[PDB]
Amino acid sequence: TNCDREPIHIPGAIQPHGVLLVLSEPGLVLTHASENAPAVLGNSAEQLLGAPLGHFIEPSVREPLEADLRSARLKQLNPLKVVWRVDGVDRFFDGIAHRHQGRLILELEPSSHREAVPFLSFFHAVRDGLSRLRDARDLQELCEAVVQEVRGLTGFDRAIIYRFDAEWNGSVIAEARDARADPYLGLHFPASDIPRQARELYQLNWLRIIPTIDYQPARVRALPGHGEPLDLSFSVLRSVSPIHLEYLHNMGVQASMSISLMKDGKLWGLISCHQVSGTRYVPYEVRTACEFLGEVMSSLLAA
Amino acid sequence: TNCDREPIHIPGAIQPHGVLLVLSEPGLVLTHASENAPAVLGNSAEQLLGAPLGHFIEPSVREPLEADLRSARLKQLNPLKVVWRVDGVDRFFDGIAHRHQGRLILELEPSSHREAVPFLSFFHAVRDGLSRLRDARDLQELCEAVVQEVRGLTGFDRAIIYRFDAEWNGSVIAEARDARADPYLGLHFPASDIPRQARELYQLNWLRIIPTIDYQPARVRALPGHGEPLDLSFSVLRSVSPIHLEYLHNMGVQASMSISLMKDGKLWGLISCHQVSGTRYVPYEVRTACEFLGEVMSSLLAA
Numbered sequence: 029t030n031c032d033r034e035p036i037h038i039p040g041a042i043q044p045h046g047v048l049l050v051l052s053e054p055g056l057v058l059t060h061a062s063e064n065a066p067a068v069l070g071n072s073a074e075q076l077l078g079a080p081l082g083h084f085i086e087p088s089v090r091e092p093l094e095a096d097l098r099s100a101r102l103k104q105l106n107p108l109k110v111v112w113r114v115d116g117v118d119r120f121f122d123g124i125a126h127r128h129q130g131r132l133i134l135e136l137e138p139s140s141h142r143e144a145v146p147f148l149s150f151f152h153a154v155r156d157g158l159s160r161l162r163d164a165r166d167l168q169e170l171c172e173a174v175v176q177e178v179r180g181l182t183g184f185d186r187a188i189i190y191r192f193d194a195e196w197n198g199s200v201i202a203e204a205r206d207a208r209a210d211p212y213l214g215l216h217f218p219a220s221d222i223p224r225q226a227r228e229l230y231q232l233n234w235l236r237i238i239p240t241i242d243y244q245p246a247r248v249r250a251l252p253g254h255g256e257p258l259d260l261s262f263s264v265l266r267s268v269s270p271i272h273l274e275y276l277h278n279m280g281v282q283a284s285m286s287i288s289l290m291k292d293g294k295l296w297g298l299i300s301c302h303q304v305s306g307t308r309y310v311p312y313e314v315r316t317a318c319e320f321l322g323e324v325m326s327s328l329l330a331a
Numbered sequence: 332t333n334c335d336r337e338p339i340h341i342p343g344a345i346q347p348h349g350v351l352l353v354l355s356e357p358g359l360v361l362t363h364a365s366e367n368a369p370a371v372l373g374n375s376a377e378q379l380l381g382a383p384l385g386h387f388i389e390p391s392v393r394e395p396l397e398a399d400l401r402s403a404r405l406k407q408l409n410p411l412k413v414v415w416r417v418d419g420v421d422r423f424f425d426g427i428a429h430r431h432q433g434r435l436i437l438e439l440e441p442s443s444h445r446e447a448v449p450f451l452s453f454f455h456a457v458r459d460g461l462s463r464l465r466d467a468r469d470l471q472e473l474c475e476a477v478v479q480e481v482r483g484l485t486g487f488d489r490a491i492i493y494r495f496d497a498e499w500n501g502s503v504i505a506e507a508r509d510a511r512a513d514p515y516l517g518l519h520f521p522a523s524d525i526p527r528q529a530r531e532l533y534q535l536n537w538l539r540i541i542p543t544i545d546y547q548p549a550r551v552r553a554l555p556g557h558g559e560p561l562d563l564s565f566s567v568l569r570s571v572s573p574i575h576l577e578y579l580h581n582m583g584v585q586a587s588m589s590i591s592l593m594k595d596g597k598l599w600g601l602i603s604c605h606q607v608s609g610t611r612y613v614p615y616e617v618r619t620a621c622e623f624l625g626e627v628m629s630s631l632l633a634a
């Protein structure tokens with residue numbers, strides 16, 4: 029048994045700082061809604077399950093949202109602009125929608141505290157970041173550039189490159205840190221700290237974020253006949269394995285984010301980030317800029 | 332003599348669809364203004380020369396603009412938001428500012444016809460583009476990906492990869508085209524079609540755009556004692572060599588854009604684009620996304 033066996037892709041629950049919905053196609057009837065919807069959205073699961081999405085959307089953004097949701101080109105279209113009209117009182121969300129195993133999953137995170145131009149911060153992050161990565165003259169300089177850039181953009185206490193060896197053991201080959209975070213640079217860890225089914229999932233889904241390791245999972249409720257494990261492999265809000273939360277607690281880490289580094293189709297390593305005290309809800313534009321930099325680094329892993 | 336000798340970096344004039352200003356430091360007094368300022372800005376050179384920039388800027392965007400102009404971090408801060416208050420009647424511009432040879436040059440192009448979210452189109456362009464470039468499995472697939480993406484983003488009739496050989500002759504090794512543009516794929520051209528001082532300039536300044544080859548150059552006027560050739564090497568609006576305009580006329584090309592491809596610090600090739608009929612004022616976000624893709628391709632020129 030041991031670590032390789034837990035089915036981390038179907039926990040039945042999400043991290044409660046966003047809301048997860050499942051939408052029928054083509055009608056966009058909600059078949060599933062996470063149970064934190066009252067706190068986040070201002071509606072109960074009973075109001076949600078079996079209602080059409082449009083009923084809750086401010087009418088002027090409604091048709092474009094529905095058009096996007098039916099597009100597949102789906103992302104490419106993320107993030108979706110979601111204005112949730114309840115009281116109302118519009119609430120604003122970035123929607124991240126994806127299709128997996130026959131389900132259309134729409135995840136809602138509250139739109140950033142504004143106020144700077146939308147997507148300007150992404151524009152600058154990836155331009156400045158690309159040119160620092162291109163200054164690197166070898167693999168070690170690349171790693172140190174990436175970790176400095178990611179720590180700069182996010183404000184995480186620690187950011188490392190964690191490289192896998194042939195046996196899937198890993199080592200900390202680059203680190204940028206606040207002084208206040210103990211230095212992990214140079215440490216090697218056994219393969220079971222990132223077990224096989226996690227590594228397999230992380231070859232497909234290149235980003236995970238845990239803005240606080242102390243949260244109450246919000247169960248995903250479903251219409252009768254629906255529900256039945258929801259495959260959450262590509263869902264950003266997926267509740268993470270409790271044994272990993274305990275590992276982070278024991279490391280003394282309150283919040284985490286990691287990004288897969290790919291090479292020739294195979295997981296090569298991770299950019300891994302920790303907040304040592306306090307939480308870390310990384311804004312959408314920052315997270316996405318960091319993933320973009322990880323894709324650039326992955327493409328450069330030919331030098 | 333021949334082609335290598337013309338001093339293309341100091342033509343004394345600009346392409347008239349934007350305005351070029353030179354600003355003193357730290358006071359931001361205009362020492363130079365291109366003579367098309369009446370058409371573009373609504374002020375004469377006489378009103379401009381020796382006035383402080385702030386006098387013309389809408390007061391609520393004035394302090395941040397001046398702060399940026401004095402920053403160096405200068406870009407990194409481009410584009411600058413420039414609201415020009417004359418009549419007034421605000422007019423809106425993207426400012427591209429740079430320092431070169433001791434001058435602070437501010438170039439003003441009219442802000443795009445709006446209306447979509449600012450920088451959203453850049454966000455999508457570089458994300459979708461990066462993932463198509465990463466699908467390429469060899470140099471030829473890379474070239475064909477780049478040319479398809481750039482043509483898709485811009486709408487140019489033709490987009491090619493033009494690769495330099497050891498003697499600086501070039502060949503068209505990839506092409507995407509409207510059918511209506513003759514195919515240049517496979518053609519080789521002599522080194523003098525892109526002469527030595529152009530190639531040297533294009534190792535430093537990675538983008539040039541000619542939205543119409545038929546334009547009246549707008550001379551750059553200067554305060555007494557100033558003026559004296561303005562080095563326009565890094566200026567986007569720099570008027571281009573008339574012999575090159577004739578070459579484009581003769582190719583049957585009405586508008587052009589090219590991007591340098593760099594490898595190990597040396598010019599490797601160009602992404603070159605043509606509009607065969609009609610003009611092509613590529614919006615700022617599109618141009619900048621194309622340059623970003625050229626930087627990615629340049630970084631990948633290790634495979």
Ligand SMILES: */C=C\C1=C(C)C(=O)N/C1=C\c1[nH]c(Cc2[nH]c(/C=C3\NC(=O)C(C=C)=C3C)c(C)c2CCC(=O)O)c(CCC(=O)O)c1C
Nearest residue numbers: 031036212217220221222226268269272275284285286300
């Ligand atoms: C057998 C069970 C497990 C033991 C024992 C253990 O130590 N982890 C077990 C299961 C497990 N881990 C993860 C995900 C995971 N683990 C890491 C490990 C590290 N983070 C670091 O910074 C370092 C070294 C400094 C190590 C080593 C990481 C980065 C991750 C990814 C998640 C994150 O970024 O925090 C999982 C999967 C958790 C999930 O996706 O649900 C499991 C089951």
Ligand SMILES: */C=C\C1=C(C)C(=O)N/C1=C\c1[nH]c(Cc2[nH]c(/C=C3\NC(=O)C(C=C)=C3C)c(C)c2CCC(=O)O)c(CCC(=O)O)c1C
Nearest residue numbers: 334339515520523524525529571572575578587588589603
């Ligand atoms: C000796 C004078 C010149 C002769 C003869 C000639 O043919 N060109 C001469 C000078 C010259 N060229 C350029 C810039 C330039 N030339 C090219 C050439 C090509 N564009 C194509 O698509 C192809 C093949 C299909 C060729 C070959 C290009 C791309 C450029 C860059 C400008 C642009 O993108 O249109 C200059 C410099 C012009 C300037 O920067 O002021 C000069 C002096």
